[PDB]
Amino acid sequence: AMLSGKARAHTNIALIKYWGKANEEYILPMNSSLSLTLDAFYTETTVTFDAHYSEDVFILNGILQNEKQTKKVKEFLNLVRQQADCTWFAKVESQNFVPTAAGLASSASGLAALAGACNVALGLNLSAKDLSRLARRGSGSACRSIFGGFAQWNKGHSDETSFAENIPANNWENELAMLFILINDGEKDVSSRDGMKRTVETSSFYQGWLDNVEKDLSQVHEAIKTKDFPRLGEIIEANGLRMHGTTLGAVPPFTYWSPGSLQAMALVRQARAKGIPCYFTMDAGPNVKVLVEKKNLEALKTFLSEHFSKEQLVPAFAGPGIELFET
């Protein structure tokens, strides 16, 4: 009496940020977002539901995860089980294909992969849209990893209308790259879920954030239509900076930046001034991702080696949507 399934899902990085929930229980977002799915970084996950299991078990890179480390996994299992009316404990075994000690965020690829594996195990037979909705409920950013290339998460107004979709771009995503700059001098960081909640509830800058998301999204779409990279880059760099601005107005205020983050951001500006078109973005942590055209990627990598070891500079390209496998 067992049911099992497997999936592989790639990470995505938001160019227009999701920051703050309109509904915390269903992870309905206050604003729509837009991401690029990447090839380099991904998660492979198997799940087994078995009547003979005695508790939920989560293994990550071969290491048994403790209660706190399993929290998003455990909550997703309960909600997928309630949706299937399944009463069995599960075993989740996941492997993250990210660079050693990089400290990448893996909730997007991990919960997306877990959602795909559960869809297979429990025979839910979900469409891509409904698979995105399911993964949304484990982690908002996971719903975009269902899709490859550019994807948009439409905020919607309901569990039924909040989900992601691919954005066709005439293969423009295949001309682009993202160079990760790995920064480790970071303080202990508020989780994305807790930080965005504190920002929604207390930041005097959050209305300014909301008032600007939709125009940024429209201009990303216009830029994609004309393959206008400097225009894309200027929009997404300011969007990310605006997102981080909101945490300095929270109560108490906080920042995700480390000293190295600022050095990296300053160097991106110098690279642009030397004529290398490239634009930075940060999520809920100190790493700095640099959006650049493929033709300019080695120039950018060379320039940045003056201050960062080669271990600290990891390129990624456009990647595919989720893949499901039977066991």
Ligand X SMILES: C[C@@](O)(CCOP(=O)(O)OP(=O)(O)O)CC(=O)O
Instruction: Please state the residue numbers annotated as binding site for Mg(2+).
Output: 107
34 in the Ramachandran plot: left (φ > 0), alpha (ψ -120 to 50) or beta? beta
DSSP 123: T
275 sits in which H/E element: none
How, if at all, do strands 90-97 and 57-60 pair? parallel
DSSP 187: P
Whose Cβ is closer to a second copy: residue 99's or residue 253's? Answer: 253
Q: Which does 43 bind (CB under 5 to 8 A by kind): a second copy, ligand ACP, Mg ion, none?
A: ligand ACP
Residue 85 contacts residue 45 (beta carbons within 8 Å):
no
Binding letters toward Mg ion, positions 178-197, x by CB under 5 A: --------------x-----
Whose Cβ is closer to ligand ACP: residue 58's or residue 172's? Answer: 58
Q: Which does 242 bind (CB under 5 to 8 A by kind): ligand X, a second copy, ligand ACP, none?
A: a second copy
Does 262 participate in binding a second copy (rule CB under 8 A)? yes
Binding letters toward a second copy, positions 205-234, x by CB under 8 A: x-xxx-xx---------------------x
Q: Which does 317 bind (CB under 5 to 8 A by kind): a second copy, ligand X, ligand ACP, none?
A: none
| Helices and strands (H, E) in the chain, number of each type | 8, 14
Distance CA 8, CA 248 (A): 37
Residue 57 contacts residue 69 (beta carbons within 8 Å):
no
Neighbours of 57 (CB within 10 A): 16
93: which residues sit within 8 A by CB, 6+ positions away? Answer: 45, 46, 47, 59
Whose Cβ is closer to a second copy: residue 193's or residue 269's? Answer: 269
Give contact residues for ligand X (rule: CB under 6 A): 14, 17-18, 27, 33, 105, 107, 139-141, 192-193, 283-284
Nearest to 216, CA basis, from 142, 135, 279: 279
Q: Which stretch binds a second copy (CB under 8 A): 135-143, 152-160, 202-210, 219-227?
A: 202-210
What are the structure tokens assigned to 143, written together? Answer: 């719903």
Neighbours of 40 (CB within 10 A): 18
Nearest to 223, CA basis, from 263, 268, 167, 184: 167
Does 102 participate in binding a second copy (rule CB under 8 A)? no
Q: Which does 91 bind (CB under 5 to 8 A by kind): ligand ACP, ligand X, Mg ion, none?
A: none
235-294 residues in contact with ligand ACP (CB under 6 A) are 284-285
Q: Which residue is nearest to ligand ACP (CB)?
A: 110
Q: Which does 46 bind (CB under 5 to 8 A by kind): ligand ACP, a second copy, ligand X, none?
A: none
Q: Which does 60 bind (CB under 5 to 8 A by kind): ligand X, ligand ACP, a second copy, none?
A: ligand ACP
The residue assigned the tokens 């050693």 is: 100
Shortest distance, CB of residue 55 to ligand X, whole angstroms?
A: 23
Does 241 participate in binding a second copy (rule CB under 8 A)? yes
Nearest to 202, CA basis, from 254, 256, 163: 254
Site for ligand ACP, rule CB under 6 A: 43, 45, 60, 69-73, 94, 96, 105-107, 110-111, 114, 139, 191-193, 284-285
